[PDB]
Amino acid sequence: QTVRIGTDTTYAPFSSKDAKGEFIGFDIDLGNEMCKRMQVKCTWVASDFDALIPSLKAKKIDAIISSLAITDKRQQEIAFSDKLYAADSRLIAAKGSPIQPTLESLKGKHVGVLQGSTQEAYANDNWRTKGVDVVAYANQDLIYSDLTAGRLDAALQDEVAASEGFLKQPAGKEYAFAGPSVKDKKYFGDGTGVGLRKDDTELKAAFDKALTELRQDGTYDKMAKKYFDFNVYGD
Numbered sequence: 001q002t003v004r005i006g007t008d009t010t011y012a013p014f015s016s017k018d019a020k021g022e023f024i025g026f027d028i029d030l031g032n033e034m035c036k037r038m039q040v041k042c043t044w045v046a047s048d049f050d051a052l053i054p055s056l057k058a059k060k061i062d063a064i065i066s067s068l069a070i071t072d073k074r075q076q077e078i079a080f081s082d083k084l085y086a087a088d089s090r091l092i093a094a095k096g097s098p099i100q101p102t103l104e105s106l107k108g109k110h111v112g113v114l115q116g117s118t119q120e121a122y123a124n125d126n127w128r129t130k131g132v133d134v135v136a137y138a139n140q141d142l143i144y145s146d147l148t149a150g151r152l153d154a155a156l157q158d159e160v161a162a163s164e165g166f167l168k169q170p171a172g173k174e175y176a177f178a179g180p181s182v183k184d185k186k187y188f189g190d191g192t193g194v195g196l197r198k199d200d201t202e203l204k205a206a207f208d209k210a211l212t213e214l215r216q217d218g219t220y221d222k223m224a225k226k227y228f229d230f231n232v233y234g235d
């Protein structure tokens with residue numbers, strides 16, 4: 001039909017808006033390229049990240065492309081395409097900060113996470129319970145803003161989003177990663193994928209076919225090179 005694809009546009013370089021409100025980023029490029037090969041029209045629909053799976057279940061959108069990690073919990077509720085790219089999580093803080101992604105370091109500190117994210121799940125279970133002030137936000141822009149305002153000591157999000165979308169931008173010049181990637185298979189998933197209703201077998205097959213084809217002919221790498229000088233796909 002027309003495939004309606006939901007995304008949250010506060011996660012550069014994967015999904016954001018340009019100065020005239022056009023959606024831009026690697027998620028947008030992947031979605032548009034897949035749609036072309038599937039020979040379908042696609043309409044992008046912006047929403048808060050935590051609204052994406054509910055909107056999909058409610059049939060207000062037909063697909064999610066929004067750095068949506070493929071997790072065990074989410075697969076109980078929806079289906080996923082094959083992996084679009086890998087996504088590790090990592091903390092950021094002010095440059096020179098001693099902060100580490102540990103309870104010892106973070107107890108009593110204010111740590112921002114995106115509401116509805118794997119980072120929120122991780123932080124709520126491991127940090128909020130034990131006395132870290134975990135603050136959950138409607139979108140990632142509010143997090144970066146509250147961090148630069150000094151209201152947050154740190155923020156947890158996807159590593160590549162933080163790096164390319166903030167640290168390497170003027171806004172994040174005085175900030176840096178605090179500690180290494182936070183690796184936990186119980187939480188952050190096995191890369192990201194197109195989120196789909198479980199019964200939409202045909203639509204999943206179509207996305208999967210287009211994805212294989214655009215990876216195979218080198219289009220994936222061509223598009224990825226616009227944003228990344230490393231292997232974003234992973235293994």
Ligand SMILES: NC(=[NH2+])NCCC[C@H](N)C(=O)O
Pocket residue numbers: 007008009010011015049066067068069070087114116117118119140158
């Ligand atoms: N467009 C976005 N805001 N994406 C947030 C993704 C965060 C994390 N990868 C998750 O799946 O929960």
